[PDB]
């Protein structure tokens, strides 16, 4: 009943052509992962930070510990190339399977094999396919644990010495920590799971999630939904797509905030500094500059009555002054050496700032994630000269947009699924209009 | 006949003058909390130190504001994105000075307004309707999330969320222009196109239907009495409206299908407003409008100004004056 | 605040005159049917 512009809805009950659509689209994803990497490597120059170069995938690989050494100094480019090639090659196999199944394979599966065929309304077959994929996902999360513990570790921006690849020997298994994150406030100073700030906790969580997912995969292969679940959901292909659109949308919003705030699993060495980081780094910079000139940064009252360089947060911690007072929850490895238990420590500040910290703060200040759409770096009133927009702005904005539209897609498909399930998605029956059988409101 | 099932029947009853529903169960308390706090704060809240510099801005009527200048003032920059419910303040006096009420109102409103959208789905299902009116309201709702939640999250402070007042609104949009060059951002340009176009097609559609009402009345009565609520016959001649509008332009730029026409009416302003909400939501991460400052230079290298450079001079004057006491270092990085 | 004294009378009349006009016409409409 569908028009050309809703033509993929013709595949709802063609399990074989729909397999090809999914596997061909999977090929597109792997193609871009591979092609984009080789593009980035072909354009890569090692003497320039990655984040001066518009790179979003090399940073993900480097973060896994490949290609880099202490400081995030790029040591060997070959791992990048390998990652690109293997993805690109693998997409031909998926392209092949997709076009075969979309064009020449059996339109529908459930006659060829009772194992691969499915009816959307078969709750047991659907929980079984769900289960298999849960196990796969669980395996995937464990692959990351294997890399971290058994195949070379991961890049650790907090490694003493400026950062380095470190093998994770004691992943956090304590569920008070792992699940503790899931119960922290999403608000400032807390940051829900975005606040994870060490790789022990990252790796330990992936142990938990891998087991949870394997466990649930087995659960769902072996069970059928209980009656309260049967009566609360709509059971149709569109309904299931709507559920996943919702889940992907929520995940996209989380990822947005992850890449905007988190400088552990998005190390600032690769991705550039966070907004808060950059802003903290500016107050650091002029504090250093002014103190070298003789200023007593601790006793210096600014125009407002608040300290020009240092003040208290609302819970009293000594923090950087100016507008960056808003960003005092920032934690970064270049800054923490200066923190005591009351906050920033005046004697470490007077006495213990190192050149590498001066350098890092000037670098981050001048690479704040501010830029125009045509990649002119800096505040919006800045003149042309510097070709630069932070990878974090690109990754945050793109995924906010996609997250938003997947939420619209969820509402679109969830409403439609309900109405099709009830039988009125195509309009109101003139001879049985519900409202005309209802009493008037007044 | 059971208690819970009778309650469920009343919650979801199509017979209440105003539909409640399960979304209604969250909407009603949260919009009552936000409404009541807003009204009291607008009239009588004391000044709030929006920018965290112990410089309180007077927002309410009893502190010398009128309807145009008053506002519930955003909470303090010293708080940033920290949650500041009443019970986290030593006292109400502190909660007031630091701008507590803004937080209470925007969180309750955004909740209740999200449930408003869901309530639109729900009643659509109880009445046997198609379900996507709520998708059209997601455009305004996304816009309110952008200026009250998303932009604060990206800039790190609810002090930079939009004030709840008329001049506070203007303050927000002037500062936005200096910090993001929003005029030169394509997504804002699509908002304008969605909103100008929306008002255009509103006028068009209304004038075309109105031009083709079928004579049912006399010159001494409102034409509106020619339509009776619930009549089965359409009340205007669409072929006559098509015949006029297609000759005003040409035939094929005109709609003879009322379904396509009304779907067009829905999609144009909705999609434009999605994009402009997306504009605010991505400028929240400082992906700003096109920057063509000094983009034209001559053979020697003198800068040859364009209209973009003139825009920059105005943005500069906004930049250097806003929050004139709050910056101690040379760059306004958030 | 040092505010235009006549603002009050102006506002009251601005409200009152057009509102009374409307009420007059409505009430005599209901007395017909």
């Amino acid at each position: 009943g569908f028009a050309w512009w809703a033509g993929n809805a013709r595949l709802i009950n063609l399990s074989g052509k729909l397999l090809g659509a999914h596997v061909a689209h999977a090929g597109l994803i792997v193609f871009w992962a591979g092609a984009m990497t080789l593009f980035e490597l072909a354009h890569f120059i090692p003497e320039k930070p990655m984040y001066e170069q518009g790179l979003i995938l090399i940073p993900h690989i480097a973060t896994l510990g490949w290609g880099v050494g202490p400081g995030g100094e790029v040591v060997d480019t070959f791992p990048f190339f390998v990652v690109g090639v293997v993805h690109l090659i693998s997409s031909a196999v998926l392209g092949f399977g997709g076009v075969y199944h979309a064009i020449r394979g059996p339109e529908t599966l459930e006659e060829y094999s009772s194992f691969f065929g499915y009816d959307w309304k078969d709750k047991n077959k659907m929980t079984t396919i769900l289960g298999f994929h849960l196990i796969v996902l669980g395996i995937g999360a464990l692959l990351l644990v294997a890399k971290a513990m058994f195949f070379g570790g991961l890049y650790d921006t907090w490694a003493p010495g400026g950062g380095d690849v470190r093998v994770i020997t004691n992943p956090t298994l304590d569920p008070r920590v792992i699940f503790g994150y899931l119960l922290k406030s999403p608000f400032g100073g807390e940051g829900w799971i975005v606040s994870v700030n060490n790789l022990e906790d990252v790796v330990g969580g992936h142990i938990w999630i891998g087991l949870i997912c394997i466990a649930g995969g087995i659960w769902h292969i072996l069970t059928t939904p209980f009656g309260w679940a049967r009566r609360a959901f709509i059971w149709s292909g569109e309904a299931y797509l709507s559920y996943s659109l919702g889940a992907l949308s929520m995940m996209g919003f989380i990822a947005t905030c992850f890449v905007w705030f988190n400088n552990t699993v998005y190390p600032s060495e690769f991705y550039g500094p966070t907004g808060p980081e950059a802003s903290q780094a500016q107050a650091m910079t002029f504090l250093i500059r002014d103190q070298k000139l003789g200023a007593n940064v601790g006793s210096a009252q600014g125009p407002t009555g608040l300290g020009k360089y240092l003040m208290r947060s609302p819970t009293g911690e000594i923090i950087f002054g100016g507008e960056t007072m808003r960003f005092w929850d920032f934690r970064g490895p270049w800054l923490e050496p200066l923190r005591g238990p009351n906050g920033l420590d005046l004697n470490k500040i007077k006495n213990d700032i190192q050149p590498w910290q001066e350098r890092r703060a000037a670098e981050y200040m001048t690479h704040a994630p501010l830029g125009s759409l045509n990649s002119v770096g800096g505040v919006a009133t800045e003149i042309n000269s510097v070709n630069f927009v932070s990878p974090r702005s690109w990754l945050a904005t793109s995924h906010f947009v996609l997250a938003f539209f997947f939420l619209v897609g969820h509402l679109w498909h969830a409403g439609r699924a309900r109405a099709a399930a009830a039988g009125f998605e195509k309009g109101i029956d003139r001879e049985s209009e519900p409202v005309l059988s209802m009493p008037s409101l007044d | 006949a059971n208690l819970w099932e009778r309650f469920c029947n009343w919650v979801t009853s199509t017979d209440n003058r105003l539909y409640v529903g399960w979304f209604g169960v969250i909407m009603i308390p949260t919009l009552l909390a936000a409404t009541i706090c807003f009204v009291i704060a607008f009239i009588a809240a004391p000044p709030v130190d929006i920018d965290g510099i112990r410089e309180p801005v007077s927002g309410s009527l009893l502190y010398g504001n009128n309807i145009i200048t008053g506002a519930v003032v955003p909470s303090s920059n010293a708080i940033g994105l920290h949650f500041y419910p009443i019970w986290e303040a030593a006292s109400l006096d502190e909660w007031l000075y630091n701008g507590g009420p803004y937080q209470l109102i925007i969180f309750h409103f955004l909740l209740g307004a999200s449930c408003y959208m869901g309530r639109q789905w729900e009643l659509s299902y109880r009445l046997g309707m198609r379900p996507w009116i709520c998708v059209a309201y997601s455009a305004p709702l996304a816009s309110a999330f952008a200026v009250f939640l998303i932009y604060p999250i990206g800039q790190g402070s609810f002090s930079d969320g939009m004030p709840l007042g008329i001049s506070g609104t203007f303050n927000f949009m002037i500062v936005f222009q200096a910090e993001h060059n929003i005029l030169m951002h394509p997504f804002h340009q699509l908002g304008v196109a969605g909103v100008f176009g929306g008002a255009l097609f509103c006028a068009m559609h209304g004038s075309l239907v109105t031009s083709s009402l079928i004579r049912e009345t006399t010159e001494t009565e409102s034409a509106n009495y020619g339509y009776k609520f619930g009549q089965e016959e359409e009340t205007y001649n669409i072929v006559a409206a098509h015949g006029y509008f297609g000759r005003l332009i040409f035939q094929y730029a005109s709609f003879n299908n009322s379904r396509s026409l009304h779907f067009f009416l829905a999609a144009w302003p909705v999609v434009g407003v999605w994009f402009t909400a997306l504009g605010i939501s991505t400028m929240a991460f400082n992906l700003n409008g096109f920057n063509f400052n000094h983009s034209v230079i001559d053979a020697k290298g003198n800068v040859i100004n364009t209209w973009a450079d003139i825009i920059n001079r105005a943005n500069l004057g906004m930049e250097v004056m806003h929050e004139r006491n709050a910056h101690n270092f040379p760059l306004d990085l958030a | 605040m040092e505010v235009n004294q006549l603002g009050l009378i102006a506002t009251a009349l601005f409200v009152l005159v057009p509102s009374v006009f409307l009420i007059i016409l409505y009430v005599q409409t209901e007395s017909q049917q």
Binding site: - | L61, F229, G230 | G7, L8
Partner: peptide
């Protein structure tokens, strides 16, 4: 006085809302 005027008008609008909703002309079919 200006405060009283502003709140008074606002209060009238809210009252009008009440009557417009609950004491409307009830739409009747055909």
């Amino acid at each position: 006085m200006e405060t009283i005027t502003y709140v008074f008008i606002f209060a009238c609008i809210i009252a009008l809302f009440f009557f417009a909703i609950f004491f409307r002309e009830p739409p009747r079919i055909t």
